[PDB]
């Protein structure tokens, strides 16, 4: 029983989830997504 419980606890620790949430939030902050600016943009492209 204790062997089973420690196997389950170790698997659950390996099964943690908040780290990915923190990483995604950090990436969102680093990239700093936004929409503020012009209504639409006109740009330059040399279409083949």
């Amino acid at each position: 029983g204790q062997k089973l419980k420690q196997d389950g606890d170790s698997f659950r620790m390996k099964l943690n989830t908040q780290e990915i949430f923190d990483d995604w939030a950090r990436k969102v902050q680093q990239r700093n997504l936004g929409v503020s600016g012009r209504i639409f943009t006109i740009e330059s492209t040399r279409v083949r």
Binding site: R38, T41, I42, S44
Partner: peptide
């Protein structure tokens, strides 16, 4: 005095309008 149709509707090719609006967006 038979009147003739005046200047017709122009095309104003999209490229010219687009570049003019590039300029306007640049200076705004």
């Amino acid at each position: 005095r038979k009147l003739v149709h005046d200047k017709e509707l122009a095309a104003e090719d999209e490229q010219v309008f687009l570049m003019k609006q590039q300029s306007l967006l640049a200076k705004q």
